[PDB]
Amino acid sequence: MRCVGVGNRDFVEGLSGATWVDVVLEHGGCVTTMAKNKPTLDIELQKTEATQLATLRKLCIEGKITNITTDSRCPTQGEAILPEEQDQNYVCKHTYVDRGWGNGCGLFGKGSLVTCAKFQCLESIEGKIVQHENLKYTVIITVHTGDQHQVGNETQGVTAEITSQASTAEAILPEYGTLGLECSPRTGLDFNEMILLTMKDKAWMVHRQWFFDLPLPWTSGATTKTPTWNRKELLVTFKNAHAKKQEVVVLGSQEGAMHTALTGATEIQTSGGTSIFAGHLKCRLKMDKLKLKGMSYAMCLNTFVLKKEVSETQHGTILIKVEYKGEDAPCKIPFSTEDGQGKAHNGRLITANPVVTKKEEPVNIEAEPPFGESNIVIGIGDKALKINWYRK
Amino acid sequence: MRCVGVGNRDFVEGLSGATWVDVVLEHGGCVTTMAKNKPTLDIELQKTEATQLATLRKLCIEGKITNITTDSRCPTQGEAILPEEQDQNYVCKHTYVDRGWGNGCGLFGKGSLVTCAKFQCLESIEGKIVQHENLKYTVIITVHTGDQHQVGNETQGVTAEITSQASTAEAILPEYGTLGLECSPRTGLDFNEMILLTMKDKAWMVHRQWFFDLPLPWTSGATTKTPTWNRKELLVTFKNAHAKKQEVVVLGSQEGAMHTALTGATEIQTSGGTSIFAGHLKCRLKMDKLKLKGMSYAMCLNTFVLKKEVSETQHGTILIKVEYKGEDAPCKIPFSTEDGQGKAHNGRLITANPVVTKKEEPVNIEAEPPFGESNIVIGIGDKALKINWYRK
Ligand SMILES: *[C@@H]1O[C@H](CO[C@H]2O[C@@H](C)[C@@H](O)[C@@H](O)[C@@H]2O)[C@@H](O[C@@H]2O[C@H](CO)[C@@H](O[C@@H]3O[C@H](CO[C@@H]4O[C@H](CO)[C@@H](O)[C@H](O)[C@@H]4O)[C@@H](O)[C@H](O[C@@H]4O[C@H](CO)[C@@H](O)[C@H](O)[C@@H]4O)[C@@H]3O)[C@H](O)[C@H]2NC(C)=O)[C@H](O)[C@H]1NC(C)=O
Ligand SMILES: *[C@@H]1O[C@H](CO[C@H]2O[C@@H](C)[C@@H](O)[C@@H](O)[C@@H]2O)[C@@H](O[C@@H]2O[C@H](CO)[C@@H](O[C@H]3O[C@H](CO)[C@@H](O)[C@H](O)[C@@H]3O)[C@H](O)[C@H]2NC(C)=O)[C@H](O)[C@H]1NC(C)=O
Ligand SMILES: *[C@@H]1O[C@H](CO[C@H]2O[C@@H](C)[C@@H](O)[C@@H](O)[C@@H]2O)[C@@H](O)[C@H](O)[C@H]1NC(C)=O
Ligand SMILES: *[C@@H]1O[C@H](CO)[C@@H](O)[C@H](O)[C@H]1NC(C)=O
Secondary structure, three states, X not given: OOOOOOOOOEEEOOOEOEOOEEOOEOOOXXXXXXXXXXXXXXXXXXXXXXXXXXXXXXXXXXXXXXXEEEEOOXXXXXXXXXXXXOOOOEEEEEXXXXXXXXXXXXXXXXXXXXXXXXXXXXXXXXEEEOOOOOEEEEEEEEEOOOOOOOOOOOOXXXXXXXXXXXXXXXXXXXXXXXXXXXXXXOOOOOOOOEEEEEEOEEEEOEXXXXXXXXXXXXXXXXXXXXXXXXXXXXXXXXXXXXXXXXXXXXXXXXXXXXXXXXXXXXXXXXXXXOOOOOOOEEOEEEOOOOOOOOOOOEEOXXXXXXXXXXXXXXXXXXXXXXXXXXXXXXXXXXXXXEOOOOOOOOOEEOOOOOEEOOOOOOEEEEEEOOOEEEEEEEOOXXXXXXXXXXXX | OOOOOOOOEEEEOOOEOEOOEEEEEOOOOEEEEEEOXXXXXXXXXXXXXXXXXXXXXXXXXXXXXXXXXXXXXXXXXXXXXOHHHHOOOEEEEEEEEEEOXXXXXXXXXXEEEEEEEEEEEOOEOEXXXXXXXXXXXXXXXXXXXOXXXXXXXOOOOEEXXXXXXXOXXXXXXXXXXXXXXXXXXXOOOOOOXXXXXXXXXXXXXXXXXXXXXXXXXXXXXXXXOOOOOEOHHHOOEEEOOOOOOOEEEOOOOOHHHHHHHOOOOOEEOOEOOEOOOOOOEEEEEEOOOEOOXXXXXXXXXXXXXXXXXXXXXXXXXXXXXXXXXXXXXXXXXXXXXXXXXXXXXXXXXXXXOOEEOOOOOOEEEEEEOOOOEEEEEEOOOOOOEEEEEEOO
């Protein structure tokens, strides 16, 4: 009964005739399902974690200059040269500074000079490439047991992983059997014109082209260190208007500027490996092998006293909690729906075939009452439990 | 002789008649001045440091969240509340989450919820406000002694501070007297429509209006800690689409984005407190009480041997270094300019009244030879020194 108490909750009907029941599992969503002589299921879609990815490019957003070296020749004696002009960890720019007797050159004129700066990237962006057959949605299916605490507990689920190519698999629900599902991963983002850009614990999804266009020093992705940052000119600058000495200057973090830019793009909020993509996944459940929780049970012959005051959910159902003051042991719970007097049936039951498993464990049931006045009859003849109800 | 070797160098002539000489001292500049029977000065404008400033406001560019606290009531039981909502250190937002039996509220419906977060600023900007009558320009005046090392040494000068309201002040040059200057600081930036915005070791100067408009958490300037950051929401964001829990999230450093935004703005090189401003300061020096280095000397009667090969400066002068193999002691240096034969004077002498102070200290002299062929005659009769020269 996980879905119990979830805002976005879909109730799917069994279609009296056949078994299969197609669904639509979506993030922030949940779906209760029910069928004729079939348990009521609460199928949810937990995550849309992409398995392994391939990192394409790798942008730098925080540069730190180190080991500044320089060399300078006099007038009429060619440019200077540092071996650092050939290293790639180093960015260098030549320039011309006044030179005379004063500063060591017996000749007067514009001398030559070159400066270099070892570049080390602190923080950086990784632009990843994900595609269709790379995703593994995890479905959690909690059967309506009626268990004492089962009411809206996102824990009790029966886990099932459904990949793009293992498209149809089956879950084994304790004492219910096996639920086969036939899902088909459709996605409203073409993972062919989109890059999964990471950055610290976060992650977006943008255009290949755009991502590539960003003004940022990069290094075609690869693990275990020491890059050769390309285009370090977009973060490292050189100034020298007075022609005296040349100042080196990094640009400071682009984290902020990137967030600001990543406005309209959809977020993904990375979890430290896995990710939550919005993916409206459509299946079709096979009720076949899925058996029920014993029709071979007798009807309970005693009383049910309402342990927790009944409540209405955000959709138009009730949740009854009752304790059996019997001794019947395993037995069905007599559910008789009254239209105010006792002539017909207007409201139906959600928790299919509610049972008392142990005299000592309270039983939760969820029903869908009629409109306006309605009376319930949980039990039999002798002091049978009555709950009058007003709907709408 | 500091100026000697400076690219942008200005030769200001005496205007034969009176004493005063107006000049124009500028960053990146240097001016050699000269007059009749007056020493040749080398006025330069060192720094344009603004004395004491007041911080108007103070924006924050990097936020760090801490001690996250929250409180949430059931449905139909009003919003939740925290004592932190009243704290200025905490930024808080209310929102609504699904509530049911499961998560502790016997009633079903949308619950109330408030979350808070102790905001703390790591790095922050300072917007100061300077106004003309605040700053002290520092002029360095080196006289052309002709001293052994003085050739372009930016050390030997005679310091002078000229403030906006200390408009005219005088400097004592050793063995030359006193030079008076009547400066009038003019600047091409209205320090009334601009704020000097610092940021780490850097600093620019932008429009008050713009500065304030910046999307940043501020705290009207004040020293010795513990701010009450105003409008913290411009860095802190809150998420809650699924209505389960509320996520706290900062925006990361704006350093980059700021630099990025500070493009057109003119820079100032804030160096440990004091700063450099582009200021074309215009003076007028009084040559009056500025005497010269003894006309009371006799002419040197021996030989001078060129100690360092003479060289042409970036403008069109020459720098003569010579040793006096004499014994005359303190004496003038007979400077005769030849037009190629000995009929007239085409070239002058920049280094005024060149003198040898000690037989054992070389003397440097700067002269301005005629165009084309020219011959120099330093000394008298006996093997006197000659330097053939070709100009243009
Ligand atoms: C820019 O200016 C600086 C300062 O110039 C000062 O010079 C004074 C003479 C005086 O006019 C001041 O008013 C003026 O401001 C220059 O500096 C000077 O550097 C020189 C060169 O290094 C220092 O000269 C001394 O040289 C001594 C001998 O070294 C030999 O010289 C022989 C020449 O006969 C030569 O044949 C040899 O081959 C060898 O090179 C050396 O022994 C001195 O050491 C000093 O020892 C005394 C103790 O007696 C100490 O008190 C002193 O501090 C030294 O340790 C010197 O090295 C001179 O000291 C420096 N002067 C000062 C105080 O700064 C600078 O060079 C110049 N820049 C340029 C244009 O190159
Ligand atoms: C949400 O559900 C969990 C787990 O609910 C479990 O209940 C038992 C009765 C089984 O039906 C099981 O399949 C189901 O998953 C609730 O947490 C706690 O569960 C404990 C049972 O494991 C329970 O009792 C104690 O005794 C058992 C052994 O018999 C022991 O394993 C436990 O550690 C525990 O000591 C305990 O009462 C229950 N928690 C509390 C304090 O009530 C959880 O309570 C549910 N949340 C809600 C809606 O309150
Ligand atoms: C904020 O917490 C400060 C540190 O207390 C920590 O104690 C740990 C045991 C754990 O509970 C953490 O969550 C706490 O942060 C504490 O010293 C301050 O008093 C707290 N309040 C302020 C000033 O923010
Ligand atoms: C650069 O300087 C560091 C110390 O700052 C030194 O360890 C290193 O040898 C120098 N050369 C390199 C590798 O850049």
